[PDB]
Amino acid sequence: HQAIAKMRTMIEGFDDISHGGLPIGRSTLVSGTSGTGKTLFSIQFLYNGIIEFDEPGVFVTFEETPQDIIKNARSFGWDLAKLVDEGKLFILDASLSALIERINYAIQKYRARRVSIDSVTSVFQQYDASSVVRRELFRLVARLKQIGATTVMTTERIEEYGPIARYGVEEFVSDNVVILRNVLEGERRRRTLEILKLRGTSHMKGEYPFTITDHGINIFPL
Amino acid sequence: HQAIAKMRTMIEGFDDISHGGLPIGRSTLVSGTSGTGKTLFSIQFLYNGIIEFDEPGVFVTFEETPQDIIKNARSFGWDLAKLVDEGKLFILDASLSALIERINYAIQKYRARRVSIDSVTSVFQQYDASSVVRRELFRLVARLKQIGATTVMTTERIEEYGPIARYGVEEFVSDNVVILRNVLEGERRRRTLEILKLRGTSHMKGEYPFTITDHGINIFPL
Amino acid sequence: HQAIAKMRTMIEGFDDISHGGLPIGRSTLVSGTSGTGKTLFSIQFLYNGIIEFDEPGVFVTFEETPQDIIKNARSFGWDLAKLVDEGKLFILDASLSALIERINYAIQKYRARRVSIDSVTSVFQQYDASSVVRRELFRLVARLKQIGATTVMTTERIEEYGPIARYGVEEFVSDNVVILRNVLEGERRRRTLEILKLRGTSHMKGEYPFTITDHGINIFPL
Amino acid sequence: HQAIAKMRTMIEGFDDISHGGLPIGRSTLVSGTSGTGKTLFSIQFLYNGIIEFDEPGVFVTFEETPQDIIKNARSFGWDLAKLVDEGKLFILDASLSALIERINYAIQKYRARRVSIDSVTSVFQQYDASSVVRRELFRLVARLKQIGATTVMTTERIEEYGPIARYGVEEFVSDNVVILRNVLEGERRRRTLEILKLRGTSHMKGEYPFTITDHGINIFPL
Amino acid sequence: HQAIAKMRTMIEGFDDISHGGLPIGRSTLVSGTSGTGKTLFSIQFLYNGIIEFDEPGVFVTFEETPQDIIKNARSFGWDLAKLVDEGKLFILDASLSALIERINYAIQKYRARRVSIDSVTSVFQQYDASSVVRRELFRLVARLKQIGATTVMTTERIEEYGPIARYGVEEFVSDNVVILRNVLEGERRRRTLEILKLRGTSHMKGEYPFTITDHGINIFPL
Amino acid sequence: HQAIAKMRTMIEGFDDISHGGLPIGRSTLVSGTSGTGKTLFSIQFLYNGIIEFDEPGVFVTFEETPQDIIKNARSFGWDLAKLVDEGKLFILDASLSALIERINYAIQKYRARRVSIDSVTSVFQQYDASSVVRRELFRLVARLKQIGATTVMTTERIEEYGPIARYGVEEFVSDNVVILRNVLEGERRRRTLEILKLRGTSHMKGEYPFTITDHGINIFPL
């Protein structure tokens, strides 16, 4: 009566609203506007995995250099430089088949099953039509599932209440969709987290407030 | 005073609001946003048919592999692998004339009159103009009606309250239209099912709540 | 002080709100979203004419086969097969000059003055620009007026409260415009009928509810 | 302190809200959706002029034949056929320089200073860019002013509360702009008339109700 | 603590809300929909300057002939023909480098430092991209500032509450922006004047009502 | 637990809501509509730096000449001419690699670590696609970070509540985003300042009123 296994992301409150955490072997799409916490979410997923379960991670980035990410993480107190030196964490700088080959090579070398992709929207900006975007996204998700590494891919969206992704096709390809919203009402911004869908497993429905503190993302499972 | 015959879908509450179930020999278009339950609807239609009436089914999929669908079904407790091995269910992996020929060949081989199409939107993404989309959709619906197999085709739409399909032409070709809506109000999502039209037979008018539980879709015929 | 003659459509309540029925020799444009009753309106116009005034009719269809229309009509109790066999009704299957020639040939052969066109939108989908759409629509309307047969042409529109037709030019060519709206409010759908204009004769202003029952369209002239 | 002369249109109530009627020698743009009364306005202007001041008129039409206009006018009791036979009224059927030459020739032949243009939007549909539309409209208005005949040109607009014309450039070329609106509120339509501007003379500001009765347009100058 | 000099426009109430009038040597962009008073504003600026300070002016027009402008001005009681004959006012008929050369030649010949441009939108209609529009507008503004003549350039906008100009780039090039709005509420139109910005000097913030009377524009500095 | 250093902008109240001021070595994007205070913000940043910390600055401008900026600054009482003569301030007139080379040359020559860019939107207007805009913006930001000079780049946006930049990609490239809004409500304009994000450091959330007085921008840290 159950055939889905989940690995805990160890993010405070996210496992409660995801009913066990992120499913193992499936690629999640985390979408939100600028300043919501996509990069922080993808960094904290890998960092918590490495700290708790001793499971290494690979963080592929396109819009940032590794040093900037390390400084932003040390802002929270996470010494990612020590993890990179010890080999428990890998950071890949690519700034599509070659990217998948490099990710697979890193996964095999570091014996890591956890992947975070900071910006696939920047990669898809090169392509023109949304059909090609869907094809490339499906190819990447299929390769990630074949490898067997749980992946958190973050994409950018324009409007707080509108299409889940700018192209509008990301929501219909990824197995799991998580949405971060920075809603501006009454001249004040509020952060909300929503689990749009989880193919093959139950999850909470609605939006729940969360705060980006000095220790990382903290979701309130009200 | 009546010349329309209907086969029960055995979905809890859907037959009550459809006034006898899905008409026999006509192709339905089930449209909704991501995470509403189109794939689950198409899977449950075939599974309930096979279990109750011993009527085999063919499930043609484009955006997923058969193994993923089997795992997602086993999440509900449906052992689709046993049905596939016994021959009471067929799953087709195509990832347009060749597709119709393959569907007809499967129908003839398995002596099955029930077809589910998980994503024709992905197929239509290749075409550019909406006129070509209408032509291909009409060709597929005509072939399905000529074969005589009741079909449930699922398409993707962007906005909860907007065009029935992304191209806007699907609603005017399919004989029957069913709409699943995932409405986000008050930072909470609500699932609703609507029967937009049934060419040649009566149906309930409006939208009715439904829930995706661990046993499948359950519609409340209030 | 009057130079306009009208033939009664015999639709329950439509003659009351049209102040005498559809004008003779002019082509009406019946526009509405999917599931509103355009095809049923065009079928009932011809059927009521044949039954009451013994005036034969021609029903030209593009998106459907004659057999499907006959079955949908028999759902209401209308034995259109008997009328077709007796010659009192003709059904034309075209699935633009050749179409007009065929319609004129059918009109001359069957001595019928009543024409219904189920989908000119599908024909206009081939053309690209709205100017060509306007030119073709004007040509068809002029030919219909020259023939002298009262015509009911049905077109498709996307939004309940928006452009009268998808191209936006149909309203400015046809002499008479009738609008069927399927308004979704409070998670319930309501059917309304409106007479946008009647060139050269008075009509009621506003929208009136109507219901599609088992006997056909029934408008309430409140 | 005044250098503008006005000719009364004799339309009931329009002269009161226009403060003396339509200015002499300037071309008006009457814009409204379908079924508002543009064609009736242009016909009644010429008919009232001919009846009262014995000043002949020229009515150039593109979307209709003269016979249809004559029948629609006789619906109100206006025997335009007698006026055409007597030479007090001319009707031109053109279905851009040649059009202006023909209008000037008719004006010279019939010694008439009053012109109505039923559809310049249909003519402008041939052109692609709005700059060409503006150029052609300015050329026509300049030619009409050089001839010295008061002109009422009617154009089509899509939305009740939106751009004054479909192209959006008509309002900035014509000296005078009149807007007819058919507002649908509470499932009921209401007719309103507005004078957007009169270059060089004062006018009432706002919108006033008007009714199309069996005698013609009747505006209430509240 | 101050390095900006202003010349009074002598328009009733505009100097109060502009805190000293239009800055000397800078080009203003006056934007509004049709019928708001852009042409009247540009005419009254020059006329008041000539009458009060004996400072001649140049009025360059594109959408109108000089005679029409003279008649519209005489509607208010302004005998612009006498001023043109005396040489205290020049009217230029151009219906982009040649235009600037002609304006400079007129400025040098008539020893005038005041320029009004009635329609640069019509000139920019020839260009396709908004980048070229920005380049040409910047070139014209730079030439006007180099000449040293205070200029009032009027542009056309479509929506009452939307982009300041149709192209959306005029607001970011001109040093000073004034907006005239004709707001339609409650079936009544209200005229409002706003000073969007004044580069290098203070101004009132908000919108103030104004009326176009028989003596010209009159702003209420509430 | 902290690896981010900040240099105070000395703007009244901005350091309080930014929690220490602008981060050192990162490029900020200040976005707002016309008349909000982007140019004044970029000028005041450099001027306050030079006055307080004796840290020279470079102001690169595209839409204005240096003399106009000097006059607008002297409107506030800032004698930028004296600073330019003394060498404590440099103003660059460029009216993309050559621009970066010139900025680096100025930085090296004047031993200044502070840069303000008045209009990169005008530069990006030359490019067509938003992908090229993103690439050029990322290149410029990377070069600025490599140089090590704190930069304030100002971009233009159309709608008060809409995309952060006109292209919609600026918000996802710059490390820090500040938004100035000129909200028109009740026929009155209100100025608000918001810090959308600060990569790697905390900041206040919401919008706070600010006023452009005769001494410069003054933000109220309520």
Ligand SMILES: Nc1ncnc2c1ncn2[C@@H]1O[C@H](COP(=O)(O)OP(=O)(O)OP(=O)(O)O)[C@@H](O)[C@H]1O
């Ligand atoms: N130490 C911290 N304390 C609090 N908030 C922090 C801290 N460090 C970073 N942030 C938050 O990080 C946010 C922006 O950084 P983040 O990495 O989340 O960006 P993002 O949403 O992924 O951006 P993008 O869309 O450009 O990829 C800011 O809103 C800020 O509040």
Ligand SMILES: Nc1ncnc2c1ncn2[C@@H]1O[C@H](COP(=O)(O)OP(=O)(O)OP(=O)(O)O)[C@@H](O)[C@H]1O
């Ligand atoms: N065992 C389960 N219990 C409850 N809900 C489940 C279960 N398995 C799946 N779901 C539901 O399935 C939904 C998504 O899966 P589903 O197959 O319905 O997608 P879909 O709407 O067809 O997607 P797409 O638009 O990508 O084709 C989630 O919202 C989740 O709630």
Ligand SMILES: Nc1ncnc2c1ncn2[C@@H]1O[C@H](COP(=O)(O)OP(=O)(O)OP(=O)(O)O)[C@@H](O)[C@H]1O
């Ligand atoms: N026997 C019946 N009793 C009640 N309603 C019926 C019956 N037969 C058909 N209908 C109605 O017919 C509607 C759809 O069929 P119809 O022929 O009116 O479509 P349509 O609006 O012309 O479609 P399209 O836009 O695709 O041309 C349904 O909403 C259904 O309620």
Ligand SMILES: Nc1ncnc2c1ncn2[C@@H]1O[C@H](COP(=O)(O)OP(=O)(O)OP(=O)(O)O)[C@@H](O)[C@H]1O
């Ligand atoms: N005798 C009449 N009594 C009342 N109303 C009439 C009469 N004759 C015509 N009408 C009115 O004429 C209107 C449509 O005809 P009209 O000539 O005004 O069209 P229009 O607005 O110019 O159309 P288009 O946009 O297609 O050019 C209808 O709304 C109808 O009410």
Ligand SMILES: Nc1ncnc2c1ncn2[C@@H]1O[C@H](COP(=O)(O)OP(=O)(O)OP(=O)(O)O)[C@@H](O)[C@H]1O
């Ligand atoms: N003597 C007058 N008394 C009152 N109002 C007048 C008078 N003369 C002209 N007007 C006003 O002039 C307005 C239109 O003329 P105006 O020159 O202001 O047009 P505009 O806004 O510049 O037009 P466009 O956008 O076509 O350039 C009308 O709304 C009218 O009220």
Ligand SMILES: Nc1ncnc2c1ncn2[C@@H]1O[C@H](COP(=O)(O)OP(=O)(O)OP(=O)(O)O)[C@@H](O)[C@H]1O
């Ligand atoms: N001395 C001053 N006192 C008050 N406000 C001033 C003063 N000088 C300039 N301003 C303000 O400057 C604003 C416009 O100048 P500013 O340099 O801020 O433009 P901006 O927003 O950068 O423009 P753009 O979008 O064209 O680049 C006006 O709204 C005005 O109120």
Ligand SMILES: [Mg+2]
């Ligand atoms: Mg980020």
Ligand SMILES: [Mg+2]
């Ligand atoms: Mg699915």
Ligand SMILES: [Mg+2]
């Ligand atoms: Mg139909």
Ligand SMILES: [Mg+2]
């Ligand atoms: Mg008309």
Ligand SMILES: [Mg+2]
């Ligand atoms: Mg004007």
Ligand SMILES: [Mg+2]
């Ligand atoms: Mg500025």
